[PDB]
């Protein structure tokens with residue numbers, strides 16, 4: 001159970017973005033229905049007044065929270081992967097538009113799921129802004145908690161993979177446009193009950209056998225990472 005407070009740009013806090021540059025839902029309840037319009041940008045998808053200015057090669061850091069900013073972030077039972085997608089604000093989420101810029105599941109060395117590391121990072125994970133056409137974009141961050149993903153929602157409505165999904169409005173000002181944005185996948189639509197990574201037993205199966213949902217990460221991505229970049233408590 002978790003939501004996004006706002007973003008930092010190159011380590012600089014852009015202030016509370018809720019309902020201002022983030023399309024925030026009314027609360028932190030998960031999304032579970034794979035076919036629902038809520039898979040796009042959660043239950044409350046609508047243009048909000050503002051958009052964060054960035055340039056290609058900026059580091060955009062999303063800050064998640066549970067109840068208050070910089071609290072325990074997400075419950076420690078909610079093991080799973082984290083992903084970030086981009087689409088043009090043009091689409092409004094609809095059609096085959098979403099492109100993956102980041103995926104992180106289980107790191108075998110430290111033996112931590114991406115969600116564990118996000119808790120350590122005080123709710124902060126980042127992506128480098130790719131060299132797409134200047135303009136207005138939605139960045140959709142998704143945490144998949146798998147603590148009940150042994151069943152499917154469509155067969156057992158009280159269980160299933162849980163998606164904590166949030167969309168940020170971002171304006172990309174300076175960019176050479178060396179990597180124009182391709183078409184990508186629809187949400188709802190890219191995740192179905194058959195798709196790998198959706199049904200999985202984190203209690204019986206080992207985390208190394210986990211295989212995150214498709215699609216794979218666009219080659220035009222410049223990466224990202226899970227790690228604190230600023231301190232919220234100095235504010």
Ligand SMILES: OC[C@H]1O[C@@H](O[C@H]2[C@H](O)[C@@H](O)[C@H](O[C@H]3[C@H](O)[C@@H](O)[C@H](O[C@H]4[C@H](O)[C@@H](O)[C@H](O)O[C@@H]4CO)O[C@@H]3CO)O[C@@H]2CO)[C@H](O)[C@@H](O)[C@@H]1O
Pocket residue numbers: 001028066067074075077078147148
């Ligand atoms: O851990 C192994 C076990 O997990 C079982 O699932 C548990 C979760 O482990 C547990 O974390 C979860 O807790 C939820 C709780 O159900 C919600 O009601 C609560 O919602 C709050 C929210 O936290 C607040 O921010 C908001 O303001 O109010 C709402 C409503 O009160 O959120 C917590 C997590 O933060 O409960 C699950 C039970 O369904 C699995 O079922 C089991 O298979 C695993 O073995």
Ligand SMILES: *[C@@H]1O[C@H](CO)[C@@H](O)[C@H](O)[C@H]1NC(C)=O
Pocket residue numbers: 033034035036037154157
């Ligand atoms: C899931 O969402 C779809 C599309 O809106 C809806 O029609 C369907 O009834 C929902 N499923 C359940 C189990 O509520």
Ligand SMILES: [Cl-]
Pocket residue numbers: none
């Ligand atoms: Cl839960």
Ligand SMILES: [Cu+2]
Pocket residue numbers: 001002030075078
């Ligand atoms: Cu939860």
